[PDB]
Design a protein around this ligand. Structure first.
Ligand SMILES: Nc1ncnc2c1ncn2[C@@H]1O[C@H](COP(=O)(O)OP(=O)(O)OP(=O)(O)O)[C@@H](O)[C@H]1O
Ligand SMILES: Nc1ncnc2c1ncn2[C@@H]1O[C@H](COP(=O)(O)OP(=O)(O)OP(=O)(O)O)[C@@H](O)[C@H]1O
Lengths: 115, 115
């Protein structure tokens, strides 16, 4: 798939085409929708530029256009070779979500008293 | 002038039409140029939205269009009444710059030892 976090950026309208069952499911869908911009934002922030403007410029562009943080330019990602494995992206997303959504269900935390 | 920090936002091409004498003057001009977006960003950030995207949408718009953070939408701001005194804007800019650029010239700081 496309590299630079653009592959997760192109799946936001798939979440926009979802009908939640209730308000809490809608909250979770919005959480994932806001999370989907995080890798591209982090890559752009590590390059010294403002990641939100870069992310908005990526979503306002065509589906083949992403941000090259090395050259700092908006390019064709397949033609420039900036590509990612699909397995890596889905594995990272699923493994992050499964533990973080379970962590957010907590009300009580029990720890050992430090000796 | 226009309110919402847009009056300082419309003076950025006036800085783009400047020729610095050396590199340090260029650094100072860039400092003021980056500072000119700060009040609109702060107003948008206090409203719960991302201020950088709002600022970019303001500069991509016409000269009469700004952001109403009360209604959260982009409007003709003379017609909507969001206006500022010119004296207040220039007083704030000059009073901030005069002390802050002198503060940034410091190399040594001498303080009294706390008793
Ligand atoms: N020139 C580039 N422009 C834009 N994005 C790029 C560029 N080169 C790599 N990337 C992106 O940066 C990410 C790679 O980051 P990095 O390899 O440091 O971390 P990771 O793969 O998440 O984890 P790990 O630390 O295990 O390697 C991928 O999303 C890749 O598509
Ligand atoms: N509805 C609005 N939409 C957008 N900007 C607005 C709106 N109402 C006011 N503003 C802007 O917000 C700023 C006013 O902020 P505020 O009065 O809290 O601070 P100040 O004038 O800098 O200082 P002081 O605390 O001394 O009043 C002005 O720039 C004004 O144009």
């Amino acid at each position: 798939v496309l590299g630079g976090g653009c592959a997760l950026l192109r799946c936001i309208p798939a979440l926009d085409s979802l009908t939640p069952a209730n308000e809490d499911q809608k909250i979770g869908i919005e959480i994932i929708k806001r999370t989907l911009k995080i890798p591209a934002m982090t890559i752009a922030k590590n390059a010294g530029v403002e990641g939100s403007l870069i992310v908005e410029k990526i979503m306002q562009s065509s589906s083949e256009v992403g941000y090259d943080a090395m050259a700092g330019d908006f390019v064709n990602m397949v033609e420039k070779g900036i590509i990612d494995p699909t397995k890596v992206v889905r594995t990272a997303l699923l493994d992050a979500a499964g533990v973080a959504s379970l962590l957010t269900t907590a009300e009580v935390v029990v720890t050992e008293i430090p000796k």
